[PDB]
Structures are given as C-alpha cells and as structure tokens.
UniProtKB/Swiss-Prot annotation:
Induction data: Expressed from an upstream promoter, P(Aba2), in an insertion sequence, ISAba2. Expression level is positively correlated with gene copy-number in clinical isolates.
Gene from which the chain derives: OXA-58
Lineage of source species: Bacteria, Pseudomonadati, Pseudomonadota, Gammaproteobacteria, Moraxellales
Taxonomy, superkingdom: Bacteria
Post-translational modification: Carboxylated on the epsilon-amino group of a lysine, with the resulting carbamate functional group serving as a general base. Probably N-carboxylated at Lys-49 at neutral pH in vivo and undergoes complete N-decarboxylation, at pH 4.1, in vitro. N-carboxylation at Lys-49 probably increases catalytic activity under physiological conditions.
InterPro entries noted in UniProt: Bact_Transpept/Beta-Lactamase, Beta-lactam/transpept-like, Beta-lactam_class-D_AS, PCN-bd_Tpept
Places the protein is found: Cell membrane
Its biological purpose: Class D beta-lactamase which confers resistance to the beta-lactam antibiotics, including penicillins and oxacillin, and moderate resistance to carbapenems such as imipenem; in the DH10B strain of E.coli. Acts via hydrolysis of the beta-lactam ring. Has benzylpenicillin-, oxacillin-, cephalothin- and imipenem-hydrolyzing activities.
GO biological process assignments: antibiotic catabolic process; cell wall organization; response to antibiotic
Entry keyword Nucleotide-binding: no
Coiled coil: none
UniProt name for this protein: Beta-lactamase OXA-58
Chain positions found as N6-carboxylysine: K49
Regulation: Activated approximately 3-fold by the presence of 0.1M NaHCO3.
Amino acid sequence: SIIDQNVQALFNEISADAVFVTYDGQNIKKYGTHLDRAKTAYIPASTFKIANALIGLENHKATSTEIFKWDGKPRFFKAWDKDFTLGEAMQASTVPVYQELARRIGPSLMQSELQRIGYGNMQIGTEVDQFWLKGPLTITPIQEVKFVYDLAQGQLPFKPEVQQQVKEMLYVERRGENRLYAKSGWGMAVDPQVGWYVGFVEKADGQVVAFALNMQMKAGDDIALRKQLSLDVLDKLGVFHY
C-alpha cells in the first residue's frame, strides 16, 4: 500500500474533485480526491471519439485513410480549418470531423450500435452530432476503463482491423517498448464541467493497464493538467516510469 499512498499524495495538491481508475483485466482500483466519481455517469465528451471511430469504420461509413475535407466554414478553433483523416482529428480532437462521421452513421445505427456494445447509458436523444457533448449520453469512469482495456486487447465486438486502426489513432508515446495510448476530453457545455484522460499502457509482453482520470473542470483550468497528472500517477504506480 505505500505505492497507493504515494499516488494519493499527488492528489493533495489538486483542489478539484477527481478520481483515477485503473483496470488490469482482473481488478479495478480507484485513486484520488473523490472516489464515488468512479461509479458516477458523466457525459463522455471527446472520449466518445473512440466509440464513434469504431462504429464508423465497422459500418463502412469511413476508412482510416479517407480525408475529411474542410468545407470552408470557419470552425471553433482556427486549428480545425483544414483537412483531416480520422486519426489526425482524433489527436487534434477535431469535433466537426466526428460530427460529420456521426451524421453519416445516422441516429438509427448510432443508437442500435451503442446498444449492441453497452456503451454507457446508450442514450443519444434527437441530435446525432451533439449527444456526447451535451448529453443525454453518459458513462462512468469504470465503464470507460473497461471499454478501452478491451480495445487494447482487441476484445471489443468489432472487427480486429477496426480495433487496431482506432487503437493506433490513440498512440501518444513510448518509453522502451511500453506504449501509452490516450484520449482527452473536456465537456464544457454541462454543469459541472467534466474532464477526462482515458487510455492504457501496453507493456512489452502484451500486458495492459487501462486508466481513466475523471475530474471536475472549470473555466480557465490548465489544459495540460489532465495529462500531467495522469502521467505522474502512472509513474508512481510503476506502470509508466519517467
């Protein structure tokens, strides 16, 4: 438990309510300032880009090589006023590209697919391109780690090539043969705001530790904290040493 103590000590400097869940295929473990967050359902925000890419590719609404052309209408960030593959958009977190994908998928299929995979509460409302940003779709940090753990292992109910393509869209960095995969999220249009850093670490031998940071955000918070903190934790856990 000293490892667990050292992880908790990092959270001493964190004002916000926060939980960091890990899953290694056997056990769920929970760290942070408010543990009940782990069983609480929040909107997925940009972490839904994971499920959206899977559903899209599985159902032949896009390929991972296909370019999503900027349509010329300026977008919320200047950074988004350009062309993207699904993987480039995953890393830039390019909302309008995934909105276009979701429109191609359509409400009937988006619905039936989330039901088929048990994603969160499987609710999409009437706006096929808004539901992960505004609700009504919600999901617990525990459900997010189990989801990405399965992705890491190719155990989701999607074609293996689909899973591998989406998996690699999430690749961030490696240290030796340990690989870090992740997706950030910040749901700004709900109260309270929710911040996510969801992913997994794949060891040399195929062992996986999935993780899900979930915390409360507010206006003006440091964009990079979610990652800094997840990394600090993974280092203290001995999962992804600096």
